[PDB]
Amino acid sequence: MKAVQYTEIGSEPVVVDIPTPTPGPGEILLKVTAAGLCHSDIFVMDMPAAQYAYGLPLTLGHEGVGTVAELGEGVTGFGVGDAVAVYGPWGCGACHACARGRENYCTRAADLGITPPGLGSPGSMAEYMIVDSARHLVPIGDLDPVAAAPLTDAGLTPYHAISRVLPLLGPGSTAVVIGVGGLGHVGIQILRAVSAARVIAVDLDDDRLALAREVGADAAVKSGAGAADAIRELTGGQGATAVFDFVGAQSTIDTAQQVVAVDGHISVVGIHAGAHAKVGFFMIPFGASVVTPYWGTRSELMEVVALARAGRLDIHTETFTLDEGPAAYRRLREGSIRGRGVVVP
Amino acid sequence: MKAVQYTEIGSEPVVVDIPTPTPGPGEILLKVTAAGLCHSDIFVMDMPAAQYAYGLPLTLGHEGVGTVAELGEGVTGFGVGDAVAVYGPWGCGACHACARGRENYCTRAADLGITPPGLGSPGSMAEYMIVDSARHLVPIGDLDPVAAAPLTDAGLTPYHAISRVLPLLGPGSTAVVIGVGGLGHVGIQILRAVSAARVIAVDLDDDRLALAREVGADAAVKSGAGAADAIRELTGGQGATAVFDFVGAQSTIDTAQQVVAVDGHISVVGIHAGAHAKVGFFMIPFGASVVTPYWGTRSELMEVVALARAGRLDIHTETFTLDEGPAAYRRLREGSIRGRGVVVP
Amino acid sequence: MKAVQYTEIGSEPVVVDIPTPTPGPGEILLKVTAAGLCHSDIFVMDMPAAQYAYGLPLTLGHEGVGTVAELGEGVTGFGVGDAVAVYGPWGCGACHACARGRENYCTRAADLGITPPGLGSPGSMAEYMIVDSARHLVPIGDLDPVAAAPLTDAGLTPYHAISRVLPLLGPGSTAVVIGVGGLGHVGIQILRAVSAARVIAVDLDDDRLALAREVGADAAVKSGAGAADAIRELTGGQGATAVFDFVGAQSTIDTAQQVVAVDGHISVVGIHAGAHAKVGFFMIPFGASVVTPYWGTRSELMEVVALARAGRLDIHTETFTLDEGPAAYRRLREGSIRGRGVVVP
Amino acid sequence: MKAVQYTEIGSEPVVVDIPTPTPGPGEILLKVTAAGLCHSDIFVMDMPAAQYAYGLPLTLGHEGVGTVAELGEGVTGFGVGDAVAVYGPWGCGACHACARGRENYCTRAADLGITPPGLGSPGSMAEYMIVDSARHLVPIGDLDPVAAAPLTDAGLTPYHAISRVLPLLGPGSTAVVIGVGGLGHVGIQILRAVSAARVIAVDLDDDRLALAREVGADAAVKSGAGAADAIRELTGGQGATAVFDFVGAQSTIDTAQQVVAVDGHISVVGIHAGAHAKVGFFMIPFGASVVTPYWGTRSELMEVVALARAGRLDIHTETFTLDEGPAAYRRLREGSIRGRGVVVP
Ligand SMILES: NC(=O)c1ccc[n+]([C@@H]2O[C@H](COP(=O)([O-])OP(=O)(O)OC[C@H]3O[C@@H](n4cnc5c(N)ncnc54)[C@H](O)[C@@H]3O)[C@@H](O)[C@H]2O)c1
Ligand SMILES: NC(=O)c1ccc[n+]([C@@H]2O[C@H](COP(=O)([O-])OP(=O)(O)OC[C@H]3O[C@@H](n4cnc5c(N)ncnc54)[C@H](O)[C@@H]3O)[C@@H](O)[C@H]2O)c1
Ligand SMILES: NC(=O)c1ccc[n+]([C@@H]2O[C@H](COP(=O)([O-])OP(=O)(O)OC[C@H]3O[C@@H](n4cnc5c(N)ncnc54)[C@H](O)[C@@H]3O)[C@@H](O)[C@H]2O)c1
Ligand SMILES: NC(=O)c1ccc[n+]([C@@H]2O[C@H](COP(=O)([O-])OP(=O)(O)OC[C@H]3O[C@@H](n4cnc5c(N)ncnc54)[C@H](O)[C@@H]3O)[C@@H](O)[C@H]2O)c1
Ligand SMILES: [Zn+2]
Ligand SMILES: [Zn+2]
Ligand SMILES: [Zn+2]
Ligand SMILES: [Zn+2]
Ligand SMILES: [Zn+2]
Ligand SMILES: [Zn+2]
Ligand SMILES: [Zn+2]
Ligand SMILES: [Zn+2]
C-alpha cells in the first residue's frame, strides 16, 4: 500500500510503498477515507535527533477517518463498511482517568508504551490503517469524510480546551482566540455553538482575520505589539474572560497575560519550544488560571461529531492526494493552507 | 485608642494613640476582640517606597474578630454585643463577581479605591475598628475570638484555594501542602475535613513537620532539594493531584511542578516577589492547571466559621497584647510563632 | 399616582389613585417605564381567601423596569436618571444562599416577611415604585424598557431553570420546552444562545407553535395525548435530555416523565394547583432528576440583560396603558397575548 | 459447581449444582471469594410472575469479589490470581454515557439485553462466575474479600447518590440518612469521609440507631411519624441540605419532603413498589431536586475501593457458607443481619 512517512531526522516526509497491515486480536483495519495534517506534525519533524522519540519510519497522520475493512479476532460493535473517526490519544483504558474516557490524561500510557497513530504508532496518511481497539472508533454516519477528519484534533483539541472552563463563558463573557488556522478556525465555531461568549480572533495575517469573521468571530485583531491594547479597547479595561492561544509562542502568551481578566483563564494550546506562561503574583491577575491542555476525551469527540452532524461546524479544508502528501506539508509550513489540509487516499 | 501602625517606609510598626473612629452611615464600629498577624504584613512592610501603595500611616491587621459596639445610621442586621468576624477583601458589591459573593475577585474595587482593613483601610490591630457595610460581617456566636481571628484569612485563604479544585480531591487523591505556618497548618485540617485526599506536608522546620502531623497530615517531609523525590517516593510515579504552595518561593514552585500529576493542580498561594510557575509544554504535565488565588469569598468565610464551630479546626495561636505588637512581628519575621500570632487589645 | 391593584378576593384588578411613595433609608424610588404581566398574577388572584397571603390591597407587577427618580437616605451606586431593572425575589442579603447572590433561595425571607414587589410588596404596575435596596437594581443602559421588563422574570426564570442543568445540554442533547408563552418563548431563545441543544417546542395553540419556530425552535409539536409519542419520534428511543415545563399541569408533567431520558432532567416551572411529578422507581427513568425551581439569582439576571444587550433575545410584547391594565389581565386569562403583555405608565 | 439460584416464581432460592462456566472470548472466569446479599434481591424475588423479567433459573448475587481463575480468548490487563471486584451495572461500552464510564446510565443496555450479574445474568453466589469484559473488573489488592464484596453496591450505590450532589454538602450542611442497613451504614461513612456534612441517621430499630452511631453518625432519630419534627429539632427550622433515603417507602419519602431544605436534595435510593416523591409547588420546597439514582459509575467504584484501602470504611458483615445461602436471605428478610450478609463459597 501507499503511505506517507517520516523516515530520516531533518528530512521531508516521503511517499513509500509498505505492506498493507493485518489486524490482530482486538484490532480493526480501516480503509482510510481522509487524513488530516496538523501543525504538530511539523513540530515533530523539527525535533532534534536527541529529542525525537516516535521511531523511524513513522506513518504520519493523527487525524483519521475511514471505513471498517477487516475485523480483528474477537472484535464486536462495528461491522465491515461502517464509517468511523479515530479517537487519537490512546490510553490503557483501565486507570482512573481512562475509566472516565479521559484517555488523553491516562496515567499509564507512557509506561506501557501506548502511543497515538501518527505520533509513535502508524498513522492515517496511508491507504489503510490499524486501530488498536473498538473503543477508539466513533461512528460518523454519512458525514463527508474530508470535513470529518479534522474533527479528531482540529475540532477535538479546542473543544476540550474550551470545555475545561465552559462555565466561565456566560452571557457577557469574552473569549479571545489566538491563531486562526486548523484548530483556531474550528475553535471560534465551537465557542459560538456551546456558549454565548463574544469571540475576538487574533492572527498575524489579514486573510486569516477574514477567515475568522467568515466562521463567526465577532471581532478580529491584528497580532503583535498592538494586540493587547486593541483587545482591551473591545472589552473595556475589564479584560478577556478566557484566552485560547492556539499559537503558544512567547509573544502570544505574553499578550494573553496582558488581556486576561481577574478570575479568568489562559489555555496554552499551541506548542512552541520553551514558551511558557509566567504564573506568579503581580505577573498575572488574581485567580486567572493557566493550563496546557492535551487533545481531548472520548465523550468530547462524540460531542464534536454531534456538532458537525447538526450543521454547526463549517470546516475549511483543502484536499490533496497521497502523492501530494509531502507538498501539502510544505504548504502547511509556509502557512498557505487556509484551514485544514486533508489527504484523501 | 491604642493601635499598631506602619508609619515609615522601611521601619518597624509602632504602637500609637489615635482617635477612636465613629461609624458613619452604613458603617459598624467593632470592639476588636482579636487581630491576627499575617506573613503578608511582612511582605507589605518590605515593599520599596516606590511600590508601597497602602498609605501612611496604616493600622495593621487584616484578620479581625470583635463585638458590635456601635451601629452607623441606617445599619440593620446586627445588634450591639453581637460577636462577628470581618470579611476582608471588600468589593463594590454590585458587579457580576460581587453579586456571587466573590468580592475578592471584584472587577471594580481597584478603580473605586476600595481597600481591605489593614491593607489600605484602617485594620484590626487596634482597640476598635470600622467596617464599611453589614455584608462584611459574619456571625461567629460563642467562638473563642483568639482562635477565630485567624479564620478570616489563615482559614479563608487556603479554604478558597482548596475550593477551586475540590472536585479533583477524591478518594485516592493526594494533596501536598508546602509551608506549615499560619495558613498551611489550617490548610491541612481543611483538606482532612472536606475531602478524602491523602495529605503530605512539606516544611523547612522539623518542629513544623511535627505540627503538620499533629493536625492530621498523613506524611511530612523536609523541604528543599530532596523534597520532590521524597514526595514521589510517597505517591509513586503518579505524583500529587494538587499542590498548595503556601510559601511561593521559586524553589517551592519548582518542587510543585516536579511532583504535580497529569490533569492536576498547582495553587501558588504564598507570595514571593518575582517567583512564578512556568506553564508550558515539556515544563509541566498535560492538564495541570496553575493559579494564584486571592483571599476568599463571603460564603466561603461562612463555611470556615462553620468548620470551626463543628470543632474541625484546631487553630494553633500565640496571644500578644497590643503593646507587644511590634515584637510579635519580629517573632513572625524570624519564624518563631508556632502557628498564628494573635493580638488581643 | 395611578396604579393597578388587586383589592378584593375573587375580583378583577382595578385602576386606583394612591399616593406616590417616598423612599425611606436605603430605598430607591423609580419612575416606572415598563411593567410586565405574568401568568403567576392570575394564579395569585385565583387563590381562595384562606390561601392568599400577599395582603390587600396589592399593587400588581413583579416585572419592573424604570429610571431612578429619588434616592433614599445614604443610597449609593445609582444616580437619578439611571435606567434599571428590578431583581424580584428579595432575600435577607446575609444568609449562606444570599451571600452567593441566590436570594431566590434565601432561607430567612419567609421568617422575616421579606416579599417581592407585586407579590407581597407594592409592585411595578404604577407610575412609581419603591425598591428596598440598591443591590436589587441592575443597570440596563439603553435597552428599550418594553422589551426589557420581561427579562426580569420571563427571561430570568427560564434562564435559572436551564442554568441548573446547563452541563447536561451538550452537542447531541435535546431540550423540550412545554408552553410557548411569556416564559417559554424566551426559554427557547436562551437554550439556543447558551447551549448546542436541539430545541423541541410543545403547545396547545397552533399559533404558538408558529411563534416557537419564529424564535428558533428546531421543531414544534401539538400538546396533549399524542405529544409524548411525537416527541419520541423526533428524538428516537433515547428521549429528551431535559424537559422544561412552563405549564406544569398534571398532563404536561406526565408527558415530561414519558419523554425524559435516563440521567436527564425535568424542571417543573409552570404552576398548577396540586400537579406534581411522581419520582419513584418504574415511574421515571434512572437518574432523571426533577425540581420546581424559583425565579433566579442576581448574577443570572445580569447574564439575562447581557443576552438582551448582545441581541440574542427577541422578546415578543404587546403594550398597554395603565388604564388598560385590567383588560390586559383578561387577555392573559384568555390566552390572546402573543408573548408578554407589558404596561407602560 | 455449587450455586444459589432463584428457580421458581414466589419460592425461596435453592442451593443447586450446575456446570462450572468457561470464559468465552473477552470474558473472565473468577473464583468467587465473597458474594454480598442485597435487599434488592428480596424485591426481585417478591416480584409477581407478570413483572419478573430476569429469567429462571437465576444465580443470585450482584455484589461480587474474587480472584481471576481463567482468561477468555484475547483478554488483556489482568493475570490469573489477581484479586478483583466486579463492576455490576454492565453497559454497552460505546454510547455517550458509557464513554464517561457511566455505564449505570447506558442508553443502549436495555435494547441490547445487557444485564448485570445477579440481575439477569448469572450472579456471584457460586464458586465461580463469569465477567463479560475486563473493563468490568477493578483491582482490590490485598483487601479482605469479605469486607470488599459490599463495596460493589452497598458502597458504590450510596457513593454515587452522594456524589451527584456533593458540592451541596459543605461545612454547615446536614445530610439525613434514612435506613441504616447494608447501604445506609456505608453511606454514613462515605459522608464523613468525603464531606463536612453533619450526618443524622434515621431507622425503625434502636439497635440500628446504635449501628449508626458506631459508624460515625452525629445523631440518630427514630423513624416514623415523629421523625420530621425530631430532625427539624436538630437542624433548626432550616431543614436538611440533603436526604438520602435508603428505604424509599412512601412514609420515608414523605419524611424527606417534610425536612429537606430550600435548594436541597432528596435521593430516593431504596426501592418500594409504587412509592414516589411528589414534586410540585406547595408540596416541596423551592429548588429541592429529587432523583432515583441507579448503582454507580466505573470511576466511582475505584474511588470506593480507594476509601476502603485508606481505612475510611468499616464494613459490618456476617459471613455465610453457600449452603446457608437461602437461610441468609431469610435473615435479611427479617432484618436480623447487622450490616451486610456475605457468602464465602
Ligand atoms: N495541545 C494539543 O493537544 C495540540 C493539539 C493540536 C495542535 N496543537 C498545536 O496547536 C498549534 C496550531 O496548530 P494548527 O494545526 O491549527 O496550526 P496551523 O498551521 O493550521 O495554523 C497556524 C495559525 O496561527 C497563526 N499564527 C502564527 N503565529 C501567530 C502569532 N504570532 N499570532 C497570531 N497568529 C499566529 C497563523 O497565521 C495561522 O493562521 C500548533 O502549535 C500545534 O502544534 C496542540
Ligand atoms: N494568596 C493570598 O490571598 C494570601 C493570603 C494570605 C497569605 N498569603 C501568603 O502566604 C504565605 C504564608 O503566610 P503565613 O502567614 O502562613 O506565613 P507564616 O510565617 O505563618 O509561615 C511560614 C511557614 O512557611 C515555612 N517555609 C518558609 N520557606 C519554606 C520553604 N522554602 N519550604 C518549606 N517551608 C517553608 C516556614 O518554616 C513557616 O512554617 C505568605 O507569603 C503570605 O504572604 C497569601
Ligand atoms: N417557578 C417560577 O419561579 C415561575 C416564574 C414565572 C412564571 N411561572 C409560571 O409559569 C407559567 C407560565 O407563565 P407565563 O406568563 O409564561 O404564561 P402565559 O400565559 O404567558 O403562557 C402560557 C402558554 O402556555 C400554553 N399552554 C397552556 N396549557 C398548555 C398545555 N396543556 N400544553 C402545552 N401548552 C400549554 C398556552 O398555550 C400559552 O402559550 C405560569 O404557570 C406561571 O405561574 C413560574
Ligand atoms: N437504587 C439502587 O441502585 C439500589 C441499589 C442497592 C439497593 N437499593 C435498595 O436500597 C434499599 C436498602 O437496601 P439494603 O440492602 O441496605 O437493605 P437492608 O435490608 O440491609 O437494611 C434496611 C434498613 O432499613 C431499615 N428500615 C426499614 N424500614 C424503615 C423505615 N420505614 N424507616 C427507617 N428505616 C427503615 C431497616 O431497619 C434496616 O436497618 C433496598 O430497598 C434496596 O432494594 C437500591
Ligand atoms: Zn495534532
Ligand atoms: Zn489509563
Ligand atoms: Zn493575610
Ligand atoms: Zn464588585
Ligand atoms: Zn412571574
Ligand atoms: Zn437570605
Ligand atoms: Zn443491590
Ligand atoms: Zn452504553
DSSP B164-208: TTGGG--TT-EEEEE--SHHHHHHHHHHHHH---EEEEEES-HHH
Domain B158-294 class in CATH: alpha beta
d(CA D201, CA D208): 9
Write down the residue that cell numbers 384568555 correspond to: C334
Q: Output the CA–CA distances (angstroms, integers) from residue D29 to A99, D21, D70, D124, D146, in the order listed.
A: 22, 8, 5, 11, 19
DSSP letters spanning A137-162: EEE-TT--HHHHGGGGTTTHHHHHHH
**Range C50-73 burial, b when 16+ CB lie within 10 A, else e:** eebebeebbbbbbbbbbebbbbbe
**Helices (H), ranges, chain D:** 39-45, 96-99, 109-112, 145-148, 156-164, 182-194, 206-214, 227-235, 250-259, 298-309, 325-334
**A306, C194: Cβ pair inside 8 Å?**
no
Assess whether the C-beta atom of B41 lies below 6 angstroms from ligand 2: no
φ and ψ of D36, to 5 deg: -90, 140
| Count of residues in chain A | 345
φ and ψ of A195, to 5 deg: -150, 170
Q: Which residues in chain D have their CB less than 8 angstroms from residue C262's CB?
A: 97, 105-107
Cα–Cα nearest to B66, from B153, B139, B157:
B139
The protein residues having their C-beta less than 5 angstroms from ligand 10 (an ion) are C 91-92, 95, 98, 106, 108
Assess whether the C-beta atom of A178 lies below 6 angstroms from ligand 1: yes
Cell of A7: 523516515
| Residue B345 near residue B126 (C-beta atoms within 8 A) | yes
Cα–Cα nearest to B157, from B291, B11, B34, B296:
B296
d(CA B61, CA C247): 55
Q: Output the CA–CA distances (angstroms, integers) from residue A133 to A74, A87, A126, D311, in the order listed.
A: 11, 10, 19, 36
User: Relative to the CA of C295, which ligand 3 atom is closest?
Assistant: 3
Domain boundaries, chain D: 1-157+295-345, 158-294
Query: What is the radius of gyration, based on Cα positions, of chain C?
Result: 20
CATH homologous superfamily, domain C1-157+295-345: Medium-chain alcohol dehydrogenases, catalytic domain (3.90.180.10)
Assess whether the C-beta atom of A158 lies below 6 angstroms from ligand 1: no
Cell of D41: 434481591
d(CA D39, CA C52): 46
Cα angle C229, C235, C236; round to 5: 80
| Residue C268 near residue C291 (C-beta atoms within 8 A) | yes
State the number of CA atoms in the 13 A half-sphere of B76 facing the CB: 8
Distance in Å, alpha carbon of D263 to nearest chain C alpha carbon = 6
Cα–Cα nearest to B329, from B53, B123, B86:
B123
Distance in Å, alpha carbon of A135 to nearest chain D alpha carbon = 7
Ligand with an atom nearest the CA of residue A46:
1
Cα Dmax for chain B? 61
DSSP letters spanning D300-342: HHHHHHHHHHTT-----EEEE-STTHHHHHHHHHHT--SSEEE
Q: Output the CA–CA distances (angstroms, integers) from residue A297 to C45, C171, C226, D39, in the order listed.
A: 52, 14, 39, 37
d(CA A290, CA A254): 12
| Residue B216 near residue B188 (C-beta atoms within 8 A) | yes
Coil vs helix vs strand at D84 = strand
Please give the span between the terminal C-alpha atoms of chain D, in angstroms, as a whole number.
Answer: 10
Distance in Å, alpha carbon of B267 to nearest chain A alpha carbon = 9
Coil vs helix vs strand at A111 = helix
Omega into D57 within 30° of 0, i.e. cis? yes
Cell of B17: 494613640
Task: Give the amino acid at B331.
Answer: R
Q: What is the DSSP letter of D172?
A: T
d(CA C277, CA C248): 9
CA–centroid distance for B283 within its chain: 29
d(CA A317, CA A37): 10
Cell of D113: 439485553
Give strand ranges (E) for chain B.
2-6, 14-17, 28-36, 58-59, 63-71, 83-86, 128-131, 137-139, 174-178, 198-203, 219-222, 240-245, 260-268, 277-279, 289-291, 317-320, 340-343
* Nearest CB neighbour to D302, from listed A26, A96, A101: A96
Ligand with an atom nearest the CA of residue D60:
11
d(CA C61, CA C123): 5
Q: According to the entry, how was the structure determined?
A: X-ray
Q: How many CB atoms lie within 10 A of CB A179?
A: 25
Resolution (A): 2.0
| Residue D288 near residue D262 (C-beta atoms within 8 A) | yes
Please give the span between the terminal C-alpha atoms of chain B, in angstroms, as a whole number.
Answer: 10
| Count of residues in chain D | 345
Assess whether the C-beta atom of A269 lies below 6 angstroms from ligand 1: yes
Cell of B201: 506536608
Cell of D312: 475510611
Coil vs helix vs strand at B265 = strand
Q: What is the DSSP letter of C69?
A: E
Write down the residue that cell numbers 493485518 correspond to: A22
Write down the residue that cell numbers 435473615 correspond to: D331
Coil vs helix vs strand at B232 = helix
For A307, name the nearest residue in chain C, comparing CA atoms only. C171
Pocket of ligand 3 (CB under 6 A): C 38-40, 43, 153, 157, 178-184, 202-205, 208, 223, 246-249, 251-252, 269-271, 293-295, 332, 335
Stretch (H or E) spanning C229:
helix C227-235
Q: Output the CA–CA distances (angstroms, integers) from residue C20 to C31, C87, C126, in the order listed.
A: 10, 21, 9
Per-residue three-class SS string for C75-103: CCCCCCCCEEEECCCCCCCCCHHHHCCCH
| Residue C28 near residue C78 (C-beta atoms within 8 A) | yes
d(CA B192, CA B218): 10
d(CA A311, CA A193): 10
d(CA A313, CA A179): 18
What's the gap in Å between B110 CA and the centre of ligand 8? 10
Cell of C217: 425552535
**B74, C77: Cβ pair inside 8 Å?**
no
Please give the span between the terminal C-alpha atoms of chain C, in angstroms, as a whole number.
Answer: 10
| Residue C285 near residue C304 (C-beta atoms within 8 A) | no
Q: What is the DSSP letter of B3?
A: E
Residues 6+ apart with CB under 8 A from A270: A178, A179, A245, A246, A247, A248, A249, A252
**B306, D172: Cβ pair inside 8 Å?**
yes
